[PDB]
Design a protein around this ligand. Structure first.
Ligand SMILES: Nc1ncccc1CO
Length: 330
């Protein structure tokens, strides 16, 4: 089997991407944020505290003939950005792009933090990291990908995120029309439950490539590219008037600037992030200070290859016995 679904940016800055997912019988379609940095499939639901729902589509298990309470099971998650949600668990049929899993754990939110309530366009999360990070207790549950894997033509999914445009998530096959050149594969460590890999270095604009190992994770649910402070300072030093602002919470730059590209290494291959991808617009409406798409990872404890980076590439998440990541230009 295979599945193919279009992913659409929620706003004009590509802060996140939503992908329609069918849950239950008859289908309830919710728009979920596919997140390769976490391992819970959770939804706004009929059980969500009413004051914490503001425009989201909700899953109502009582209206699904295939929904079953997973008795006793609870979940609670906290994310890199301070947001959280918690609740109880149903099993139900879940379909993405034509690919169906029966008996998928659907985590129903009773509580969500303010950042979720405020995002009316995101009806929940579909986690695509390793199932070792799943928060269901007392019985940990599998991700949608882990449940689908055995049925798939190939044990893979691909992320093809658009710049200010829709893209695609594919399950079970590699669309050889979706990328240019070849795919370079690189080793993954699953020791922390993430798609953790080692970049081979970077370049700023037309500058020389610096060979240096940068461990990090490929995280579709993280907007920006977080890299060591040395690398980030080297990038922003090429933009006149850029500075790190403690008041704003990162590097900002004049919105009159033309930003240089950023290149990262994947083995002997190179992925180029155009400068425009690094512009996250005014810090506040009407400001002439713009927020940068490349930020320091110092304090976060890990480097994150978020959407600023992955949207520049066709990315293969290879879930074979020995997982690997693949990157191609597009
Ligand atoms: N990957 C993620 N998923 C959900 C919330 C936050 C992040 C990253 O901080």
């Amino acid at each position: 089997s295979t599945g193919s679904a279009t992913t659409t940016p929620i706003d004009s800055l590509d802060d996140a991407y939503i992908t329609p997912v069918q849950i239950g019988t008859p289908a309830q379609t919710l728009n979920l944020d596919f997140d390769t940095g976490s391992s819970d499939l959770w939804v706004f639901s009929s059980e969500t505290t009413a004051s914490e729902v503001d425009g989201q589509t909700i899953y109502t298990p009582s209206k699904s003939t295939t929904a079953k309470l997973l008795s006793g099971a609870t979940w609670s998650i906290s994310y890199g950005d301070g947001s959280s949600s918690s609740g109880d668990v149903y099993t139900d049929t879940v379909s993405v792009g034509g690919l169906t899993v029966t008996g998928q754990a659907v985590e129903s939110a009773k509580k969500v933090s303010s950042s979720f309530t405020e995002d009316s366009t995101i009806d929940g999360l579909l986690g695509l990291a390793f199932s070792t990070l799943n928060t269901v207790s007392p019985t940990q549950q599998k991700t949608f990908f882990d449940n689908a894997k055995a049925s798939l033509d190939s044990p893979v999914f691909t992320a093809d995120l658009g710049y200010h445009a829709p893209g695609t998530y594919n399950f079970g096959f590699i669309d050889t029309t979706a990328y240019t050149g070849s795919i370079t594969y690189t080793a993954v460590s699953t020791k922390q439950g993430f798609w953790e890999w080692t970049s081979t270095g970077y370049a700023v604009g037309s500058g020389t490539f610096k060979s240096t190992s940068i461990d990090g994770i490929a995280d579709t649910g993280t907007t920006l590219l977080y890299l060591p402070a040395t690398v980030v300072s080297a990038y922003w030093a090429q933009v006149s008037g850029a500075k790190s602002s403690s008041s704003v919470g990162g590097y900002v730059f004049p919105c009159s600037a033309t930003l240089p590209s950023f290149t990262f290494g994947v083995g002997s291959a190179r992925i180029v992030i155009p400068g425009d991808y690094i512009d996250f617009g005014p810090i506040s409406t009407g400001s002439s200070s713009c927020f940068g798409g490349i930020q320091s990872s110092a304090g976060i404890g890990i480097n994150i290859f978020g959407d600023v980076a992955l949207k520049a590439a066709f990315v293969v998440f290879n879930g074979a016995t020995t997982p690997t990541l693949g990157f191609a230009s597009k």
